[PDB]
Design a protein around this ligand. Structure first.
Ligand SMILES: N[C@@H](CCC(=O)N[C@@H](CS)C(=O)NCC(=O)O)C(=O)O
Ligand SMILES: N[C@@H](CCC(=O)N[C@@H](CS)C(=O)NCC(=O)O)C(=O)O
Lengths: 241, 241
Protein backbone atom coordinates (compact mmCIF):
# COMPACT_ATOMS: atom_id res chain seq x y z
CA UNK A 1 0.00 0.00 0.00
CA UNK A 2 2.99 2.28 0.48
CA UNK A 3 3.83 4.33 -2.59
CA UNK A 4 6.72 3.43 -4.89
CA UNK A 5 8.39 6.15 -6.96
CA UNK A 6 11.21 5.21 -9.35
CA UNK A 7 13.44 8.02 -10.69
CA UNK A 8 14.32 6.92 -14.21
CA UNK A 9 16.02 7.77 -17.48
CA UNK A 10 15.31 6.06 -20.77
CA UNK A 11 18.91 5.52 -21.70
CA UNK A 12 19.84 4.01 -18.26
CA UNK A 13 20.02 0.22 -18.23
CA UNK A 14 20.28 0.32 -14.44
CA UNK A 15 16.89 2.03 -14.21
CA UNK A 16 15.52 -0.34 -16.83
CA UNK A 17 16.30 -3.26 -14.52
CA UNK A 18 13.96 -1.91 -11.87
CA UNK A 19 11.13 -1.05 -14.30
CA UNK A 20 11.20 -4.65 -15.52
CA UNK A 21 11.00 -6.05 -11.98
CA UNK A 22 8.15 -3.69 -11.05
CA UNK A 23 6.22 -4.84 -14.16
CA UNK A 24 6.81 -8.50 -13.30
CA UNK A 25 5.64 -7.82 -9.74
CA UNK A 26 2.37 -6.27 -10.85
CA UNK A 27 3.23 -3.31 -8.64
CA UNK A 28 1.53 0.07 -8.68
CA UNK A 29 4.29 2.63 -9.07
CA UNK A 30 5.23 6.02 -10.43
CA UNK A 31 8.15 6.82 -12.69
CA UNK A 32 9.77 10.24 -12.98
CA UNK A 33 12.45 11.00 -15.56
CA UNK A 34 15.59 12.80 -14.41
CA UNK A 35 18.06 14.40 -16.85
CA UNK A 36 20.79 13.16 -14.54
CA UNK A 37 23.79 13.54 -16.88
CA UNK A 38 23.04 16.99 -18.36
CA UNK A 39 20.87 18.89 -15.91
CA UNK A 40 20.37 17.30 -12.50
CA UNK A 41 17.55 19.00 -10.54
CA UNK A 42 18.64 20.71 -7.35
CA UNK A 43 16.33 18.50 -5.22
CA UNK A 44 17.60 15.22 -6.65
CA UNK A 45 20.24 14.61 -3.93
CA UNK A 46 17.30 14.48 -1.50
CA UNK A 47 16.20 11.21 -3.10
CA UNK A 48 19.72 9.88 -3.76
CA UNK A 49 22.75 11.58 -2.17
CA UNK A 50 24.92 9.55 -4.60
CA UNK A 51 23.30 11.52 -7.45
CA UNK A 52 22.64 8.42 -9.53
CA UNK A 53 19.68 6.98 -11.39
CA UNK A 54 17.80 4.87 -10.53
CA UNK A 55 16.65 6.22 -7.22
CA UNK A 56 13.56 4.97 -5.38
CA UNK A 57 11.31 6.40 -2.72
CA UNK A 58 9.02 4.17 -0.71
CA UNK A 59 6.13 5.19 1.48
CA UNK A 60 5.76 8.58 3.07
CA UNK A 61 2.94 10.90 2.16
CA UNK A 62 1.82 11.08 -1.45
CA UNK A 63 3.77 13.97 -2.98
CA UNK A 64 4.84 15.06 -6.45
CA UNK A 65 8.15 13.37 -7.34
CA UNK A 66 9.94 16.73 -7.71
CA UNK A 67 8.89 17.58 -4.13
CA UNK A 68 10.16 14.47 -2.35
CA UNK A 69 9.21 13.92 1.24
CA UNK A 70 11.85 13.48 3.95
CA UNK A 71 9.58 10.79 5.39
CA UNK A 72 9.85 8.33 2.45
CA UNK A 73 12.50 5.61 2.62
CA UNK A 74 15.25 6.42 0.11
CA UNK A 75 16.57 3.28 -1.65
CA UNK A 76 19.71 3.33 -3.79
CA UNK A 77 21.41 0.79 -6.09
CA UNK A 78 19.48 -1.08 -8.74
CA UNK A 79 20.31 -4.61 -7.54
CA UNK A 80 19.19 -3.72 -4.02
CA UNK A 81 15.94 -2.46 -5.59
CA UNK A 82 15.42 -5.76 -7.41
CA UNK A 83 15.74 -7.71 -4.17
CA UNK A 84 13.48 -5.17 -2.44
CA UNK A 85 10.73 -5.65 -5.03
CA UNK A 86 11.01 -9.42 -4.65
CA UNK A 87 10.64 -8.96 -0.86
CA UNK A 88 7.62 -6.65 -1.20
CA UNK A 89 5.76 -8.92 -3.66
CA UNK A 90 6.37 -12.51 -2.58
CA UNK A 91 3.30 -13.84 -4.36
CA UNK A 92 4.77 -12.64 -7.68
CA UNK A 93 7.60 -15.22 -7.26
CA UNK A 94 10.34 -12.90 -8.54
CA UNK A 95 12.83 -15.36 -7.09
CA UNK A 96 12.61 -19.14 -6.85
CA UNK A 97 11.78 -20.65 -3.48
CA UNK A 98 14.42 -23.36 -3.68
CA UNK A 99 17.71 -22.20 -2.09
CA UNK A 100 19.98 -23.66 -4.78
CA UNK A 101 17.86 -22.17 -7.58
CA UNK A 102 17.86 -18.84 -5.74
CA UNK A 103 21.65 -19.10 -5.59
CA UNK A 104 21.77 -19.59 -9.35
CA UNK A 105 19.95 -16.27 -9.68
CA UNK A 106 22.26 -14.49 -7.26
CA UNK A 107 25.37 -16.01 -8.85
CA UNK A 108 24.18 -14.92 -12.30
CA UNK A 109 23.71 -11.36 -11.09
CA UNK A 110 27.18 -11.41 -9.56
CA UNK A 111 28.78 -12.86 -12.65
CA UNK A 112 27.30 -10.09 -14.70
CA UNK A 113 28.05 -7.30 -12.27
CA UNK A 114 31.60 -8.41 -11.49
CA UNK A 115 32.89 -9.63 -14.86
CA UNK A 116 30.64 -8.45 -17.71
CA UNK A 117 29.26 -5.00 -16.80
CA UNK A 118 32.69 -3.38 -16.50
CA UNK A 119 33.69 -4.75 -19.87
CA UNK A 120 30.55 -3.27 -21.50
CA UNK A 121 31.38 0.03 -19.85
CA UNK A 122 35.02 0.06 -20.87
CA UNK A 123 34.44 -1.09 -24.45
CA UNK A 124 31.61 1.40 -25.08
CA UNK A 125 32.92 4.41 -23.13
CA UNK A 126 36.69 3.90 -23.34
CA UNK A 127 37.04 1.83 -26.50
CA UNK A 128 38.99 -0.87 -24.68
CA UNK A 129 39.44 -4.16 -26.59
CA UNK A 130 36.38 -6.21 -27.37
CA UNK A 131 37.87 -9.69 -26.89
CA UNK A 132 37.65 -9.60 -23.04
CA UNK A 133 34.02 -8.53 -23.33
CA UNK A 134 33.22 -11.42 -25.66
CA UNK A 135 35.04 -13.83 -23.32
CA UNK A 136 33.00 -12.53 -20.40
CA UNK A 137 29.79 -12.89 -22.36
CA UNK A 138 30.73 -16.46 -23.27
CA UNK A 139 31.25 -17.15 -19.57
CA UNK A 140 27.87 -15.65 -18.71
CA UNK A 141 26.22 -17.61 -21.50
CA UNK A 142 27.72 -20.79 -20.01
CA UNK A 143 25.82 -20.16 -16.78
CA UNK A 144 22.44 -20.34 -18.55
CA UNK A 145 20.52 -23.63 -18.49
CA UNK A 146 21.47 -25.24 -21.77
CA UNK A 147 18.10 -26.26 -23.09
CA UNK A 148 16.31 -22.88 -22.81
CA UNK A 149 14.75 -20.99 -19.97
CA UNK A 150 16.03 -18.16 -17.83
CA UNK A 151 19.04 -17.80 -15.56
CA UNK A 152 17.53 -19.75 -12.66
CA UNK A 153 15.02 -21.70 -14.77
CA UNK A 154 11.86 -19.76 -14.23
CA UNK A 155 12.16 -16.04 -14.88
CA UNK A 156 13.59 -14.10 -11.91
CA UNK A 157 15.13 -10.76 -10.98
CA UNK A 158 18.43 -12.10 -12.32
CA UNK A 159 16.97 -11.71 -15.80
CA UNK A 160 15.75 -8.18 -14.96
CA UNK A 161 19.33 -7.40 -13.94
CA UNK A 162 20.97 -8.58 -17.19
CA UNK A 163 18.59 -8.04 -20.10
CA UNK A 164 18.81 -4.21 -20.16
CA UNK A 165 22.47 -4.44 -21.04
CA UNK A 166 22.28 -7.38 -23.43
CA UNK A 167 19.24 -5.93 -25.22
CA UNK A 168 21.05 -2.63 -25.82
CA UNK A 169 24.16 -4.33 -27.24
CA UNK A 170 22.66 -5.40 -30.56
CA UNK A 171 21.01 -2.10 -31.65
CA UNK A 172 23.90 -0.06 -30.29
CA UNK A 173 26.36 -2.12 -32.36
CA UNK A 174 24.17 -1.74 -35.46
CA UNK A 175 24.00 2.05 -34.99
CA UNK A 176 27.77 2.28 -34.39
CA UNK A 177 27.30 3.78 -30.93
CA UNK A 178 30.41 3.57 -28.77
CA UNK A 179 34.07 4.58 -28.76
CA UNK A 180 35.46 1.20 -29.89
CA UNK A 181 37.20 0.89 -33.26
CA UNK A 182 35.62 -0.08 -36.54
CA UNK A 183 37.58 -3.33 -36.41
CA UNK A 184 36.17 -4.20 -32.98
CA UNK A 185 32.67 -3.22 -34.03
CA UNK A 186 32.90 -5.68 -36.93
CA UNK A 187 34.34 -8.30 -34.60
CA UNK A 188 31.55 -7.92 -32.07
CA UNK A 189 28.76 -7.89 -34.67
CA UNK A 190 30.17 -11.06 -36.31
CA UNK A 191 30.67 -12.78 -32.94
CA UNK A 192 27.23 -11.98 -31.61
CA UNK A 193 25.69 -13.37 -34.83
CA UNK A 194 27.91 -16.51 -34.78
CA UNK A 195 27.04 -19.99 -33.49
CA UNK A 196 29.30 -19.32 -30.47
CA UNK A 197 26.58 -17.02 -29.15
CA UNK A 198 23.40 -18.81 -30.22
CA UNK A 199 22.37 -19.48 -26.58
CA UNK A 200 22.63 -15.88 -25.45
CA UNK A 201 20.71 -14.76 -28.58
CA UNK A 202 17.89 -17.13 -27.52
CA UNK A 203 18.07 -15.72 -23.99
CA UNK A 204 17.77 -12.14 -25.29
CA UNK A 205 14.80 -13.07 -27.47
CA UNK A 206 13.12 -14.87 -24.58
CA UNK A 207 13.53 -11.95 -22.16
CA UNK A 208 12.48 -9.38 -24.79
CA UNK A 209 9.34 -11.33 -25.57
CA UNK A 210 7.94 -10.80 -22.11
CA UNK A 211 5.55 -7.88 -21.58
CA UNK A 212 7.82 -6.56 -18.83
CA UNK A 213 10.37 -5.81 -21.58
CA UNK A 214 7.99 -4.49 -24.22
CA UNK A 215 6.31 -2.17 -21.74
CA UNK A 216 9.64 -0.72 -20.49
CA UNK A 217 11.45 -0.32 -23.84
CA UNK A 218 11.10 2.77 -26.01
CA UNK A 219 11.92 0.79 -29.17
CA UNK A 220 15.34 0.05 -30.63
CA UNK A 221 15.58 3.32 -32.61
CA UNK A 222 14.24 5.43 -29.74
CA UNK A 223 16.66 3.80 -27.31
CA UNK A 224 19.54 4.52 -29.70
CA UNK A 225 18.49 8.15 -29.81
CA UNK A 226 18.29 8.37 -26.01
CA UNK A 227 21.74 6.86 -25.81
CA UNK A 228 23.15 9.49 -28.11
CA UNK A 229 22.30 12.05 -25.38
CA UNK A 230 24.85 10.44 -23.04
CA UNK A 231 27.89 12.75 -22.92
CA UNK A 232 30.46 9.95 -22.67
CA UNK A 233 29.10 8.58 -25.98
CA UNK A 234 30.86 11.40 -27.83
CA UNK A 235 30.05 11.14 -31.55
CA UNK A 236 33.14 11.05 -33.78
CA UNK A 237 35.63 9.75 -31.19
CA UNK A 238 37.18 6.27 -31.31
CA UNK A 239 40.02 4.53 -29.48
CA UNK A 240 42.32 2.05 -31.13
CA UNK A 241 44.72 -0.67 -29.98
CA UNK B 1 21.37 -32.40 6.08
CA UNK B 2 23.15 -31.50 2.85
CA UNK B 3 26.89 -31.05 3.21
CA UNK B 4 28.58 -27.67 2.80
CA UNK B 5 32.21 -27.44 1.71
CA UNK B 6 33.84 -23.98 1.48
CA UNK B 7 37.08 -23.73 -0.48
CA UNK B 8 39.02 -20.98 1.23
CA UNK B 9 42.32 -19.19 1.75
CA UNK B 10 43.38 -17.23 4.81
CA UNK B 11 44.49 -14.09 2.98
CA UNK B 12 41.21 -13.90 0.99
CA UNK B 13 38.63 -11.38 2.21
CA UNK B 14 36.10 -12.84 -0.22
CA UNK B 15 36.37 -16.24 1.42
CA UNK B 16 36.36 -14.63 4.85
CA UNK B 17 32.94 -13.18 4.08
CA UNK B 18 31.49 -16.64 3.72
CA UNK B 19 33.19 -18.11 6.81
CA UNK B 20 31.69 -15.30 8.88
CA UNK B 21 28.21 -15.99 7.56
CA UNK B 22 28.54 -19.73 8.11
CA UNK B 23 29.57 -19.10 11.72
CA UNK B 24 26.64 -16.72 12.27
CA UNK B 25 24.26 -19.32 10.78
CA UNK B 26 25.51 -22.04 13.11
CA UNK B 27 26.02 -24.17 10.01
CA UNK B 28 27.86 -27.48 9.88
CA UNK B 29 30.51 -27.15 7.18
CA UNK B 30 33.98 -28.10 6.02
CA UNK B 31 36.69 -25.67 4.97
CA UNK B 32 39.47 -26.65 2.58
CA UNK B 33 42.38 -24.36 1.83
CA UNK B 34 43.42 -23.79 -1.78
CA UNK B 35 46.69 -22.13 -2.86
CA UNK B 36 44.79 -20.45 -5.64
CA UNK B 37 47.28 -17.70 -6.59
CA UNK B 38 50.48 -19.77 -6.57
CA UNK B 39 49.65 -23.43 -7.09
CA UNK B 40 46.09 -24.19 -8.08
CA UNK B 41 45.25 -27.92 -7.97
CA UNK B 42 44.30 -29.43 -11.33
CA UNK B 43 40.89 -30.50 -9.93
CA UNK B 44 39.90 -27.03 -8.69
CA UNK B 45 38.12 -26.02 -11.94
CA UNK B 46 35.67 -28.82 -11.19
CA UNK B 47 34.41 -26.91 -8.19
CA UNK B 48 34.72 -23.47 -9.78
CA UNK B 49 35.49 -23.11 -13.49
CA UNK B 50 36.19 -19.42 -12.86
CA UNK B 51 39.19 -20.61 -10.82
CA UNK B 52 38.40 -18.29 -7.92
CA UNK B 53 38.15 -18.58 -4.14
CA UNK B 54 35.74 -18.90 -2.45
CA UNK B 55 34.04 -21.84 -4.07
CA UNK B 56 31.31 -23.90 -2.45
CA UNK B 57 29.89 -27.36 -2.95
CA UNK B 58 26.49 -28.23 -1.55
CA UNK B 59 25.01 -31.68 -1.21
CA UNK B 60 26.12 -34.71 -3.13
CA UNK B 61 27.75 -37.68 -1.43
CA UNK B 62 30.32 -37.06 1.25
CA UNK B 63 33.76 -37.04 -0.42
CA UNK B 64 37.19 -35.59 0.43
CA UNK B 65 37.30 -31.95 -0.71
CA UNK B 66 40.14 -32.68 -3.16
CA UNK B 67 37.89 -35.33 -4.81
CA UNK B 68 34.83 -33.20 -5.47
CA UNK B 69 31.75 -35.00 -6.66
CA UNK B 70 30.11 -34.03 -9.97
CA UNK B 71 26.82 -34.52 -8.06
CA UNK B 72 27.20 -31.61 -5.63
CA UNK B 73 25.81 -28.21 -6.50
CA UNK B 74 28.63 -25.81 -7.33
CA UNK B 75 28.04 -22.29 -6.02
CA UNK B 76 30.24 -19.38 -7.08
CA UNK B 77 30.56 -15.74 -5.95
CA UNK B 78 30.85 -14.74 -2.32
CA UNK B 79 27.76 -12.50 -2.15
CA UNK B 80 25.61 -15.21 -3.75
CA UNK B 81 26.90 -17.55 -1.04
CA UNK B 82 25.96 -15.06 1.68
CA UNK B 83 22.40 -14.87 0.38
CA UNK B 84 22.35 -18.69 0.05
CA UNK B 85 23.35 -19.17 3.67
CA UNK B 86 20.64 -16.72 4.76
CA UNK B 87 18.17 -18.75 2.69
CA UNK B 88 19.33 -22.07 4.17
CA UNK B 89 19.19 -20.89 7.81
CA UNK B 90 16.14 -18.64 8.11
CA UNK B 91 15.95 -19.11 11.87
CA UNK B 92 19.43 -17.56 12.22
CA UNK B 93 17.98 -14.23 10.96
CA UNK B 94 21.00 -13.39 8.82
CA UNK B 95 18.87 -10.71 7.15
CA UNK B 96 16.13 -8.58 8.66
CA UNK B 97 12.54 -9.54 7.94
CA UNK B 98 11.42 -5.98 7.20
CA UNK B 99 11.74 -5.15 3.45
CA UNK B 100 13.19 -1.64 3.98
CA UNK B 101 15.78 -2.90 6.49
CA UNK B 102 16.68 -5.75 4.13
CA UNK B 103 17.16 -3.16 1.39
CA UNK B 104 19.57 -1.23 3.64
CA UNK B 105 21.62 -4.43 3.84
CA UNK B 106 21.55 -5.01 0.09
CA UNK B 107 22.35 -1.37 -0.63
CA UNK B 108 25.32 -1.42 1.76
CA UNK B 109 26.73 -4.51 0.02
CA UNK B 110 26.30 -2.78 -3.35
CA UNK B 111 27.92 0.42 -2.10
CA UNK B 112 30.93 -1.55 -1.05
CA UNK B 113 31.18 -3.69 -4.18
CA UNK B 114 30.54 -0.86 -6.64
CA UNK B 115 32.33 2.14 -5.05
CA UNK B 116 34.78 1.03 -2.33
CA UNK B 117 36.36 -2.27 -3.29
CA UNK B 118 37.85 -0.99 -6.55
CA UNK B 119 39.40 1.92 -4.68
CA UNK B 120 41.01 -0.50 -2.21
CA UNK B 121 42.35 -2.41 -5.22
CA UNK B 122 43.73 0.72 -6.90
CA UNK B 123 45.55 1.88 -3.78
CA UNK B 124 46.83 -1.51 -2.60
CA UNK B 125 47.70 -3.05 -5.98
CA UNK B 126 48.59 0.03 -8.04
CA UNK B 127 49.63 2.61 -5.44
CA UNK B 128 47.29 5.24 -6.84
CA UNK B 129 46.47 8.19 -4.58
CA UNK B 130 44.57 7.46 -1.41
CA UNK B 131 42.17 10.41 -1.42
CA UNK B 132 39.50 8.73 -3.62
CA UNK B 133 39.60 5.68 -1.31
CA UNK B 134 39.16 7.83 1.80
CA UNK B 135 36.28 9.61 0.01
CA UNK B 136 34.65 6.25 -0.77
CA UNK B 137 35.11 5.10 2.80
CA UNK B 138 33.49 8.31 4.10
CA UNK B 139 30.56 7.60 1.80
CA UNK B 140 30.28 4.03 3.11
CA UNK B 141 30.59 5.30 6.68
CA UNK B 142 27.75 7.72 5.90
CA UNK B 143 25.43 4.80 5.16
CA UNK B 144 25.80 3.39 8.68
CA UNK B 145 23.30 4.36 11.38
CA UNK B 146 25.18 7.31 12.95
CA UNK B 147 24.31 6.58 16.57
CA UNK B 148 25.47 2.93 16.45
CA UNK B 149 24.61 -0.52 15.17
CA UNK B 150 25.41 -2.56 12.09
CA UNK B 151 24.62 -1.70 8.48
CA UNK B 152 20.93 -2.62 8.65
CA UNK B 153 20.61 -2.15 12.44
CA UNK B 154 20.89 -5.72 13.65
CA UNK B 155 23.86 -7.68 12.34
CA UNK B 156 23.27 -9.07 8.84
CA UNK B 157 25.15 -10.59 5.91
CA UNK B 158 25.97 -7.00 4.84
CA UNK B 159 28.45 -6.84 7.71
CA UNK B 160 29.89 -10.23 6.74
CA UNK B 161 30.38 -8.79 3.26
CA UNK B 162 32.28 -5.68 4.38
CA UNK B 163 34.25 -6.43 7.57
CA UNK B 164 36.88 -8.64 5.92
CA UNK B 165 38.07 -5.74 3.82
CA UNK B 166 37.93 -3.06 6.52
CA UNK B 167 39.51 -5.38 9.11
CA UNK B 168 42.51 -5.99 6.85
CA UNK B 169 43.07 -2.29 6.24
CA UNK B 170 44.51 -1.36 9.61
CA UNK B 171 47.08 -4.16 10.01
CA UNK B 172 48.09 -4.01 6.34
CA UNK B 173 48.70 -0.28 6.71
CA UNK B 174 50.68 -0.85 9.91
CA UNK B 175 52.87 -3.34 8.03
CA UNK B 176 53.22 -1.01 5.04
CA UNK B 177 51.94 -3.82 2.83
CA UNK B 178 50.69 -2.61 -0.57
CA UNK B 179 51.98 -0.58 -3.49
CA UNK B 180 51.21 2.82 -1.94
CA UNK B 181 54.13 4.97 -0.68
CA UNK B 182 55.08 5.64 2.92
CA UNK B 183 53.64 9.13 2.49
CA UNK B 184 50.21 7.78 1.50
CA UNK B 185 50.48 5.11 4.22
CA UNK B 186 51.00 7.79 6.83
CA UNK B 187 48.16 9.80 5.37
CA UNK B 188 45.78 6.85 5.46
CA UNK B 189 46.76 5.86 9.00
CA UNK B 190 46.30 9.42 10.25
CA UNK B 191 42.95 9.76 8.48
CA UNK B 192 41.67 6.43 9.76
CA UNK B 193 42.58 7.44 13.33
CA UNK B 194 40.99 10.90 13.03
CA UNK B 195 37.51 11.94 14.19
CA UNK B 196 36.46 11.98 10.50
CA UNK B 197 36.45 8.18 10.72
CA UNK B 198 35.34 7.56 14.29
CA UNK B 199 32.11 5.91 13.12
CA UNK B 200 33.76 3.33 10.84
CA UNK B 201 36.27 2.56 13.61
CA UNK B 202 33.34 1.80 15.89
CA UNK B 203 31.88 -0.36 13.17
CA UNK B 204 35.09 -2.34 12.74
CA UNK B 205 35.40 -2.86 16.48
CA UNK B 206 31.76 -3.93 16.72
CA UNK B 207 32.13 -6.47 13.92
CA UNK B 208 35.49 -7.80 15.17
CA UNK B 209 34.12 -8.30 18.64
CA UNK B 210 31.65 -11.00 17.46
CA UNK B 211 32.71 -14.66 17.71
CA UNK B 212 32.13 -15.06 13.96
CA UNK B 213 35.11 -12.75 13.38
CA UNK B 214 37.35 -14.11 16.11
CA UNK B 215 36.78 -17.69 14.96
CA UNK B 216 37.60 -16.89 11.34
CA UNK B 217 40.60 -14.57 11.83
CA UNK B 218 44.14 -15.87 12.12
CA UNK B 219 45.22 -12.82 14.15
CA UNK B 220 46.55 -9.54 12.75
CA UNK B 221 50.20 -10.67 12.46
CA UNK B 222 49.23 -14.02 10.96
CA UNK B 223 46.90 -12.36 8.45
CA UNK B 224 49.67 -9.94 7.40
CA UNK B 225 52.00 -12.91 6.82
CA UNK B 226 49.37 -14.65 4.70
CA UNK B 227 48.81 -11.45 2.71
CA UNK B 228 52.54 -11.26 1.96
CA UNK B 229 52.09 -14.50 -0.07
CA UNK B 230 49.77 -12.62 -2.47
CA UNK B 231 51.61 -11.82 -5.73
CA UNK B 232 49.75 -8.58 -6.46
CA UNK B 233 50.65 -7.17 -3.04
CA UNK B 234 54.31 -7.29 -4.16
CA UNK B 235 55.86 -7.39 -0.69
CA UNK B 236 58.79 -4.97 -0.57
CA UNK B 237 57.61 -2.93 -3.54
CA UNK B 238 56.10 0.57 -3.57
CA UNK B 239 55.12 3.02 -6.29
CA UNK B 240 55.73 6.72 -5.72
CA UNK B 241 53.71 9.59 -7.24
N1 LIG C 1 25.58 0.95 -9.23
C1 LIG C 1 24.47 1.78 -9.68
C2 LIG C 1 24.84 2.39 -11.00
C3 LIG C 1 23.87 3.45 -11.38
C4 LIG C 1 24.51 4.40 -12.39
O1 LIG C 1 25.62 4.43 -12.61
N2 LIG C 1 23.60 5.30 -12.99
C5 LIG C 1 23.97 6.29 -13.95
C6 LIG C 1 22.95 6.42 -15.05
S1 LIG C 1 23.04 4.98 -16.13
C7 LIG C 1 24.09 7.63 -13.26
O2 LIG C 1 23.23 8.03 -12.68
N3 LIG C 1 25.33 8.32 -13.39
C8 LIG C 1 25.52 9.58 -12.78
C9 LIG C 1 26.83 9.70 -12.02
O3 LIG C 1 27.54 8.72 -11.88
O4 LIG C 1 27.12 10.81 -11.53
C10 LIG C 1 23.16 0.97 -9.72
O5 LIG C 1 23.24 -0.22 -9.88
O6 LIG C 1 22.09 1.54 -9.57
N1 LIG D 1 33.69 -11.89 -7.27
C1 LIG D 1 34.40 -12.86 -6.50
C2 LIG D 1 35.80 -12.38 -6.20
C3 LIG D 1 36.62 -13.59 -5.87
C4 LIG D 1 38.11 -13.37 -6.05
O1 LIG D 1 38.54 -12.53 -6.66
N2 LIG D 1 38.96 -14.28 -5.38
C5 LIG D 1 40.40 -14.20 -5.48
C6 LIG D 1 41.13 -14.42 -4.14
S1 LIG D 1 40.93 -13.05 -2.95
C7 LIG D 1 40.82 -15.29 -6.46
O2 LIG D 1 40.50 -16.36 -6.34
N3 LIG D 1 41.61 -14.91 -7.59
C8 LIG D 1 42.04 -15.80 -8.61
C9 LIG D 1 41.71 -15.22 -9.99
O3 LIG D 1 41.12 -14.16 -10.14
O4 LIG D 1 42.06 -15.86 -11.01
C10 LIG D 1 33.63 -13.17 -5.22
O5 LIG D 1 32.93 -12.28 -4.75
O6 LIG D 1 33.72 -14.29 -4.76
Amino acid sequence: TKQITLYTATFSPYAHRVRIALEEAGAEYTTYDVDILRNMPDWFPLVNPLKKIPAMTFGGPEVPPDQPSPESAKIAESLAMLEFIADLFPDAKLLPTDPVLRARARTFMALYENYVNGQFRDVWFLGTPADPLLQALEMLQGALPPDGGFAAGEWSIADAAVIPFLARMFPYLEAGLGLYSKEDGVKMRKAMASERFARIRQYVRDCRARPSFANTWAGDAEQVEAAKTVPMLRVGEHHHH
